[PDB]
Amino acid sequence: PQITLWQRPLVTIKIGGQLKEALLDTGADDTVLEEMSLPGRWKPKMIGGIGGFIKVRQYDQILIEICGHKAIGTVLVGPTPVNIIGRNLLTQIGCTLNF
Amino acid sequence: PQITLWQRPLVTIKIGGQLKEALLDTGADDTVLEEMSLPGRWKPKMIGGIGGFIKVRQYDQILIEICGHKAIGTVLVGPTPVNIIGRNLLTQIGCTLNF
Ligand SMILES: COC(=O)N[C@H](C(=O)N[C@@H](Cc1ccc(-c2ccccn2)cc1)C[C@H](O)[C@H](Cc1ccccc1)NC(=O)[C@@H](NC(=O)OC)C(C)(C)C)C(C)(C)C
């Protein structure tokens, strides 16, 4: 669809059976979700924001539906205040910025 | 224009006669620029992201040009790793998320 930016671009996502709310974020290279269970093994990764870095677990090839649109790719899990859909998955669902 | 997301959405902005590179950031409430000088009064503000909060300087009613689009709004200045155009200004230039 078309999402204007007067409010936070919060959308519904489906991941490992559960429905959650996520922020669509063009300012993020990666996708980062709050603490949860995912299948397979994970690698270590550190990701940086405005106030410093956090330690997250990296899962690969994770199935995730974003607002009707399927995506399969990298999901990081850790102590983020918000669920963040970053560019790795925004490109898969054909997301672009327009004006 | 239509900005894709394979790479970071970095555009040229004009603020205080200075040309600067900034990140178009839908996941940001506020607009935050690295250390620079601006005219007028200011208030301190605390803003949070991944890893926590930083203290910044809040300037009101600042004019910014983003890809030749004029816009007026609040500009925060402080020790951010990157120049960031948040939703408060992206709405002014008519910027939408599409897929
Ligand atoms: C309401 O709070 C805000 O709007 N905070 C904004 C903010 O931090 N937004 C983040 C989203 C966010 C929103 C709210 C909170 C929050 C905090 C406390 C309480 C509630 N919510 C936290 C994060 C996502 C933002 O796009 C950020 C921009 C950035 C990019 C690169 C370096 C520093 C900052 N992206 C990241 O942090 C990403 N970093 C990255 O890609 O590095 C290359 C990730 C996400 C991958 C680490 C801001 C500060 C830019 C205005």
Automatic annotation (TrEMBL), chains A, B:
Keyword Protease annotated = yes
Query: What keyword terms does UniProt attach to this protein?
Result: Aspartyl protease, Host endosome, Hydrolase, Protease
Q: Give an example GO molecular function.
A: aspartic-type endopeptidase activity
Q: Name one GO cellular component term.
A: host multivesicular body
Q: Which SUPFAM superfamilies match?
A: Acid proteases
Write down the membrane topology: Lipid-anchor
Name the PROSITE patterns on file: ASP_PROT_RETROV, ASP_PROTEASE
* Location in the cell: Host endosome, Host multivesicular body; Virion membrane
Q: Which CDD domains match?
A: HIV_retropepsin_like
Q: Which GO terms describe its biological process?
A: proteolysis
Principal subcellular localisation of the protein: host cell
Checking InterPro entries in the record gives:
Aspartic_peptidase_AS (IPR001969), Peptidase_A2_cat (IPR001995), Peptidase_aspartic_dom_sf (IPR021109), Retropepsin-like_cat_dom (IPR034170), Retropepsins (IPR018061)
Question: Which residue intervals define the domain Peptidase A2 in the entry?
Answer: 20-89
Record flagged with keyword ATP-binding:
no
Know the name of this protein? V-1 protease
Q: Which organism is it from?
A: Human immunodeficiency virus type 1
